[PDB]
Amino acid sequence: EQKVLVVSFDGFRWDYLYKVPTPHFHYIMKNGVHVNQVTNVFITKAYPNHYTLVTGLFAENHGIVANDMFDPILNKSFSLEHMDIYDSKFWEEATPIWITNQRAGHASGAAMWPGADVKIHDSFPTYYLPYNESVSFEDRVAKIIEWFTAKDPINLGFLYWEEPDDTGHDVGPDSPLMGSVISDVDHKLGYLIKMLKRAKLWNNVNLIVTSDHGMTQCSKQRVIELDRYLDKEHYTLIDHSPVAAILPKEGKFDEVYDALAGAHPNLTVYKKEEIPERWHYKHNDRVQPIVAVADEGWYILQNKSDDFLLGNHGYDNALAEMHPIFLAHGPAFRKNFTKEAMNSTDLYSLLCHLLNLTALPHNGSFWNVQDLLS
Numbered sequence: 001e002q003k004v005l006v007v008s009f010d011g012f013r014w015d016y017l018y019k020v021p022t023p024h025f026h027y028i029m030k031n032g033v034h035v036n037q038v039t040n041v042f043i044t045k046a047y048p049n050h051y052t053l054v055t056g057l058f059a060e061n062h063g064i065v066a067n068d069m070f071d072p073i074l075n076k077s078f079s080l081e082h083m084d085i086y087d088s089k090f091w092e093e094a095t096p097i098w099i100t101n102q103r104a105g106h107a108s109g110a111a112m113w114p115g116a117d118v119k120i121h122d123s124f125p126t127y128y129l130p131y132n133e134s135v136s137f138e139d140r141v142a143k144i145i146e147w148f149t150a151k152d153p154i155n156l157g158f159l160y161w162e163e164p165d166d167t168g169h170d171v172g173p174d175s176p177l178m179g180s181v182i183s184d185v186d187h188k189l190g191y192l193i194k195m196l197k198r199a200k201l202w203n204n205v206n207l208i209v210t211s212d213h214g215m216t217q218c219s220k221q222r223v224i225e226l227d228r229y230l231d232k233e234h235y236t237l238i239d240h241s242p243v244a245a246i247l248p249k250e251g252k253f254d255e256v257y258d259a260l261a262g263a264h265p266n267l268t269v270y271k272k273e274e275i276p277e278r279w280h281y282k283h284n285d286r287v288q289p290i291v292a293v294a295d296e297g298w299y300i301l302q303n304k305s306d307d308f309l310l311g312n313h314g315y316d317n318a319l320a321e322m323h324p325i326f327l328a329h330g331p332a333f334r335k336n337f338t339k340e341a342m343n344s345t346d347l348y349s350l351l352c353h354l355l356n357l358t359a360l361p362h363n364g365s366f367w368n369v370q371d372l373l374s
């Protein structure tokens, strides 16, 4: 019976491995697999990308299209910043893998993974923690290890940590201060490895270490200010930057579109049905009528006092800076092997294969990632 632990270090851009010594990441690489370029999903934010990892679906299919959404059929909002994510209907266009695992008779465990503390199709992971950012990494690891060794043990665990995303936002990925947080995340990975070894799990758990997206440098010299073009009374801004999800008030669609389209060289304004197919974003009623996408490193501010951060993400998923790390170690994985590319939609197919689960309909392909396996 194979076991899998998926770890997400939020916002761990693929090339952060090289910013400072990362001996514990390199230990997994030498004894495991590493994928250089993981194409994640648009928009390149936490909630769409973590749900893709556990469904194998693009965002237009699994329905978690952003961290901040408005569903016009439900007439309900979803907002990560307000901790307003627990309305089950926002999640139920798909089924995450822990439910499929449990329907097959296994137990799953989740330590702060996005959505794992949400009731979905009347179900939770067998074991989970109510989301609380203040819980230490070491306490999250302790629960995971406890669950893998419990009287009724899990075969599938999910572990989430908010760095290096948090600091990346604050200082920007180009800051020399990033080295400190990357070194700390490497140290935390080392702690996890040590605890897996102490619990006699290191050589019988397949450890997969990845992330939701990367990070790019922003600047107060690279700002698009919407109120230079648009009357704030004539639309609602559902999501702000770098993918502005715009709901014009009744009658104002042409006004808003004509004022904003072509108004700034680094803001590309799409009507919903003209959104690029390659983003697999548009076929969902939670995609707003106008979606305005800032170019890499540009910030959208509704007005002068809107939020600004020196690092951000959410940009085009073709951009290298938006791509996350991916590496893994375990009995099912090759050793000292490097692969050039994968799609993050493929992880679900890999998980279902490792766990001997029947995958639900998805957008990835096991055949794309079979060469990672021993």
Ligand SMILES: *[C@@H]1O[C@H](CO)[C@@H](O[C@@H]2O[C@H](CO)[C@@H](O[C@@H]3O[C@H](CO[C@H]4O[C@H](CO)[C@@H](O)[C@H](O)[C@@H]4O)[C@@H](O)[C@H](O[C@H]4O[C@H](CO)[C@@H](O)[C@H](O)[C@@H]4O)[C@@H]3O)[C@H](O)[C@H]2NC(C)=O)[C@H](O)[C@H]1NC(C)=O
Binding pocket: 265, 266, 295, 296, 297
């Ligand atoms: C934010 O928005 C700005 C627009 O305001 C974008 O800037 C443009 O970027 C494009 C490339 O993406 C530039 O086009 C390239 O220009 C090169 C010449 O650049 C100089 O000269 C122009 C005037 O002609 C100035 O505007 C510019 O500042 C430079 O001083 C050409 O050499 C390029 O052609 C070559 O490459 C292309 C492939 O890229 C080939 O197809 C060609 O055959 C040729 O080999 C190309 O024309 C454009 O000049 C930039 N404009 C400005 C004002 O700088 C930013 O890209 C955008 N930001 C982001 C992050 O997307």
Ligand SMILES: *[C@@H]1O[C@H](CO[C@@H]2O[C@@H](C)[C@@H](O)[C@@H](O)[C@@H]2O)[C@@H](O[C@@H]2O[C@H](CO)[C@@H](O[C@@H]3O[C@H](CO)[C@@H](O)[C@H](O[C@H]4O[C@H](CO)[C@@H](O)[C@H](O)[C@@H]4O)[C@@H]3O)[C@H](O)[C@H]2NC(C)=O)[C@H](O)[C@H]1NC(C)=O
Binding pocket: 075, 076, 077, 078
């Ligand atoms: C959709 O749902 C919202 C409530 O849900 C909240 O907003 C959603 C957009 C979404 O984000 C949800 O997640 C979120 O929980 C309903 O919003 C209500 O809207 C009414 C107006 O239709 C508001 O009442 C108005 O409030 C004004 C400010 O105080 C006031 O001036 C208005 O008075 C005028 O109209 C009334 C009503 O006819 C009249 O009696 C007066 O004399 C005057 O003319 C009016 O009271 C509520 O505050 C909003 N409720 C909440 C809980 O926020 C929205 O109605 C709903 N839409 C549909 C189509 O169902």
Ligand SMILES: Nc1ncnc2c1ncn2[C@@H]1O[C@H](COP(=O)(O)O)[C@@H](O)[C@H]1O
Binding pocket: 010, 011, 044, 045, 046, 047, 067, 080, 081, 082, 083, 084, 085, 113, 114, 115, 131, 133, 162, 165, 166, 212
């Ligand atoms: N259930 C939750 N409630 C509130 N915030 C959360 C939750 N899950 C994750 N987060 C936050 O989501 C942020 C990541 O979003 P993002 O910037 O898109 O990567 C992290 O800083 C977390 O603190």
Ligand SMILES: Nc1ncnc2c1ncn2[C@@H]1O[C@H](COP(=O)(O)O)[C@@H](O)[C@H]1O
Binding pocket: 250, 251, 253
């Ligand atoms: N109250 C409403 N109920 C149902 N459909 C509406 C309503 N308001 C606008 N629409 C729809 O939006 C379309 C375009 O309207 P307009 O937004 O005025 O360009 C209409 O043809 C309707 O299908």
Ligand SMILES: *[C@@H]1O[C@H](CO)[C@@H](O)[C@H](O)[C@H]1NC(C)=O
Binding pocket: 132, 133, 134, 135
């Ligand atoms: C999260 O944990 C800390 C203590 O570990 C506590 O102060 C805080 O109240 C917790 N949050 C919730 C919502 O209970």
Ligand SMILES: *[C@@H]1O[C@H](CO)[C@@H](O)[C@H](O)[C@H]1NC(C)=O
Binding pocket: 303, 304, 305, 306
């Ligand atoms: C920007 O908009 C917010 C929200 O409507 C408002 O509270 C704030 O005062 C505005 N700031 C400026 C500088 O106009």
Ligand SMILES: *[C@@H]1O[C@H](CO)[C@@H](O)[C@H](O)[C@H]1NC(C)=O
Binding pocket: 341, 342, 343, 346, 368
């Ligand atoms: C990613 O998916 C696309 C479209 O399904 C496919 O053409 C491409 O080969 C995939 N890439 C990898 C590395 O699996």
Ligand SMILES: *[C@@H]1O[C@H](CO)[C@@H](O)[C@H](O)[C@H]1NC(C)=O
Binding pocket: 057, 058, 061, 280, 361, 362, 363
């Ligand atoms: C993704 O998979 C879903 C489920 O089968 C399907 O409806 C959708 O068409 C797929 N998307 C693409 C672009 O293949």
Ligand SMILES: [Zn+2]
Binding pocket: 010, 011, 045, 046, 165, 212, 213
């Ligand atoms: Zn993130």
Ligand SMILES: [Zn+2]
Binding pocket: 011, 165, 166, 169, 313
């Ligand atoms: Zn972030």
Ligand SMILES: [Zn+2]
Binding pocket: 133, 162, 166
């Ligand atoms: Zn945070």
